[PDB]
Amino acid sequence: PYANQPTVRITELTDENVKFIIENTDLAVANSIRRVFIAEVPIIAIDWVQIDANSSVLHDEFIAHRLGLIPLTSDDIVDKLQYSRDCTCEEFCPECSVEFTLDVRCNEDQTRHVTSRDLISNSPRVIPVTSDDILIVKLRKGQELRLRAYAKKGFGKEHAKWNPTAGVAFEYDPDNALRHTVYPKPEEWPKSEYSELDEDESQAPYDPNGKPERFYYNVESCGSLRPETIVLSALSGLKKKLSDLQTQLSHEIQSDV
Amino acid sequence: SNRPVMGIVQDTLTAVRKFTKRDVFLERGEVMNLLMFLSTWDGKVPQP
Amino acid sequence: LSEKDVDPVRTTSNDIVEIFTVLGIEAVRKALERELYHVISFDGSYVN
Amino acid sequence: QKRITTPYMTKYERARVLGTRALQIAMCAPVMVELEGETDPLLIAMKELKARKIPIIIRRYLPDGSYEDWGVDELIISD
Amino acid sequence: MIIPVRCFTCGKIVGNKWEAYLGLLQAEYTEGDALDALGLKRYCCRRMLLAHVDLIEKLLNYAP
Amino acid sequence: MIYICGECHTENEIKSRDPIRCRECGYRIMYKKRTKRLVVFDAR
Amino acid sequence: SLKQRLKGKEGRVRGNLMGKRVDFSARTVITPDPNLSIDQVGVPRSIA
Amino acid sequence: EYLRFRELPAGINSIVAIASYTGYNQEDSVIMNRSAVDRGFFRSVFYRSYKEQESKKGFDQEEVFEKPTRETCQGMRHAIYDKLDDDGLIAPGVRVSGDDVIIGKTVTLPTKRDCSTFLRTSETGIVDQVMVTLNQEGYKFCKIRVRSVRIPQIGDKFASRHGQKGTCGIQYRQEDMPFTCEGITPDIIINPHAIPSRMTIGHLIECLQGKVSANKGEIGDATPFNDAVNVQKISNLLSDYGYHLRGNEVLYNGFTGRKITSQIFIGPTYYQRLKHMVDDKIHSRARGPIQILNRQPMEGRSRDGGLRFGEMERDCQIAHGAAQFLRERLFEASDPYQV
Amino acid sequence: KPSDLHLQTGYKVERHMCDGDIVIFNRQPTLHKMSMMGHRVRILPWST
Amino acid sequence: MNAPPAFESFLLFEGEKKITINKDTKVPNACLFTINKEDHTLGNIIKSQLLKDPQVLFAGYKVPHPLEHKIIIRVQTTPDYSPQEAFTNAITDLISELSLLEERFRVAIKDKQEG
Amino acid sequence: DREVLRVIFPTGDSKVVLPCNLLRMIWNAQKIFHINPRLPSDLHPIKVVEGVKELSKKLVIVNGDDPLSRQAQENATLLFNIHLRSTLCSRRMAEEFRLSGEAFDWLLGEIESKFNQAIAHPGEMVGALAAQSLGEPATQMTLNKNVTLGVPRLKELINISKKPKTPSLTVFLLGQSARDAERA
């Protein structure tokens, strides 16, 4: 029984970012947490595009690429949805995917902007985050885009479109008391926003017994999940990976004996 | 030329020079990480 | 070489053909080795 | 008897003796050495070479046209 | 060709900011001010819009 | 075998024997229409 | 002519006897791999 | 401004870190951000057009566009002829892989031989356009454009604008890449050892100026003989935006989250994807076709040819003393014959 | 048909190149002995 | 042409063990844990948690090859402690820390949202 | 042996290329057998003299007991034997190396073992080896009193030419002319 006893302080919480501090953790746990924010927090994104008509100046898989990158609301439906690989249905079904439609024709002289607002989902829980709107393609008069897409569950470790973060700022030891980074000229380096030093001194005095214990986070959200949901989803997902691992380890230990 | 034809080059050569400096000190965790990448290691951690 | 006050033991020509016709096949064998060694070792390169 | 060539096996003799013996083993030739879980013909030939059991005679041709027949067991292996 | 949907570096959505960015420049904003107004603080995202070339406008000139 | 005219954009049915030429404007550059078979794109 | 076919770098002798194109050969770009041994080569599955 | 480079750019501004990260960028190699590539970073399209012409010339010999039946036509290959439409032409929007027939061409036999066009073996794209018309000679003329999307891979060449070319040695995801305190990861990591011998100082200045340009919001001026621009001036500008004046930043190891002891020079640099992609160069031969005159492996990647085992390669194997391997390459693997 | 797939001693199976296969790996121009060296094949999942 | 599927880095193909334990013959009370389809995420936390155990003599992990998706964790314990027992305790300590972290983050959100 | 060396190396350059590294072999023996340089040695000086004599007979490059073979064998290993004698001498074995009897016996075995490994293998394509060994450096040579050098000079030597590009003649003065600029 040598578990840490982390404490959490949330400094800033908006609709786009959550700023918080974790204290009394190992650097490995703090790094694995940010590393799960990016790669192992599931969301719903378009991963299956079928284009019926595309007269735009962008080729078919150019369009499909953008559709995949469009963030979709995933706050609570993502937990309910199953992985299409795990689901027992056919290619797709409502329990493992969300169907999308896009049918735009340009007939006016003015350029027609095909945006995420033109994506229509079969489930109100999963919609483009913008509903300015993300531009998919611009249509000239006489050009049309007619496609149907399926959005499925996934996480950033597979493709960056399932990464829910727009930048995870991670920091520790802002005053470099541990000297994990050695400045050739410390006076030349800007103070961290979390620096507690005075203007006169550039580095905190070296701490021979110090260890990384306090970690600063700024988890910005793409929009698919609330920033606080990304953190909670990461903490439960990381716990799930460990609990799943221990179940396998228990069998291996039992199997050997 | 009765000498080796290949040696340590680029990163490893630049880093091994830094690594073998007198003032390079490694903590217990750092050392155990490096020994994971030593295929010929006998499994005995040397006295620091 | 025949000139007075000129050392006839060390006085040498870099011209291989001149050495052969004056000193012989074994002298040019040695001279050829020295001349080839000069070009190889000129930049510090070493060949066995 | 009356051999002037080196008593050591040359690197070129080792390469061909092992390669030739491996093919013989690969062609179901009897294995002179006892093998335990060895199925690669080339690794088996290495065991025979170490055990000095390869049934091959190396015939070294001299420049004058004569030859000396050496048994692989007679020659000194580099290892 | 067209404004990338996400910033290449961090994945922030930038494909809904090109028209707003152009409008701000129309409003006499400097490029730095317009990027700040759009919330692009990291220079990776500012790179996306500051260096974008909208060739799709040229392509729409050609009749389908 | 529908063919879209390269200039006036008119779908034209041309057999393997009749000449390739627009019915309306007589343009000589034709384009095959997009196949009815639907290809699946991963949005990656 | 016949003489032209035999002489030169691309001739019959130098181009087809001293050197020739061979089966069971592969070519592709090379990239670093510090996790391989010096005596290993990482090979694509398509070539394998 | 006068080269129209703004109107038709040939590159992307990349967050480039000059660091020795994992040894996968050594010797002019490059580490790319897998997540950035997943977002379209340096994604490119390869368009290849195939032109085929049906011409009738001779007393009873003619060429036509049609689907060649394995029984009716004499010549035939192990490729797939199912994609071809009734008029012998593949349709746009159809996925095509290696050993696929895009143009069905049959020449009447003096029943009929097969001259059908086979898609390039490596190529795996989608038929983009199928243009049919009359060529200058008045014969029916078809051009087929096949579109293939090229996602940057390991082995693809990338260069800065300073002669620092390099293939991609590995691609790391965003979490694996080193990050700044702001969460910025480099799109590309180049080895520091590429700079000293090459002395591409303009690369370092562009990175420093690029950082100021992105933060300031102004396109930087790198006109060569301009006293108004100095490294010190650029460095002073960078300080005003809360960065180290020399372009260094404290980076954290992405695998462990620990600060890297050395601060890494990182900033925006314009890189360009070069035409040379590994998938266009990878070539393997294992008992292919042989040429008629010499009965030796064919020549060229597009012909499934063998690699040349030339005199230099032969001289090398003589020094090795590998007589049997030399015999394999020059006799057994090229043109074994009996007389 | 498995009858033709049945193997018996003396048959040869032309199997795919696998890990540990010995190959000669060459860079041109081949100037010295180390320009061609033997390598053990390791299969890795990319095209280089 | 040779691009592995993206899912291959976290999905086990049929017949693949998630984790295997191999005794280390070099030294006593040492085992090697080969975990499939895992990366520095779990390797680092498990290694760092093991180093907190006073009965663990050696704890270390490695990714043998970035293109492969294996992590090898080497654990050496004292004679009275088993590497397998250290591994299980390390995960429980990690799970307890993560579960406690989840609870304290939820409270922080509620406090921040409330005011 | 000292006088023989003076003839072989009139310039006095003692750096040579020889099969076995005796100084490192001695260093290995000191570490392997934990030789203590401070304590007196138990290695009899005569065992050093006799041991080296026996070793020299084992290092055979030209086998045969006839006078022609014996002379070639003496000539083939002349330099190594001189180096061996001046390194494994009794004075030095007792003064600085301080090897013990066990260490010295091991040392003699290593020299024999490493010397035999150095002998050229029959079938070695030494001509191809020499061509590549003298050709690979040429790929790093530059092209152009001044004297021709690099690749252009290498051509003149192998393309032996009636008229060299830069013929020259190094003349050494014999009598007082050498040391007198006026007389020179």
Ligand SMILES: [Zn+2]
């Ligand atoms: Zn389902």
Ligand SMILES: [Zn+2]
């Ligand atoms: Zn960004």
Ligand SMILES: [Zn+2]
């Ligand atoms: Zn028309």
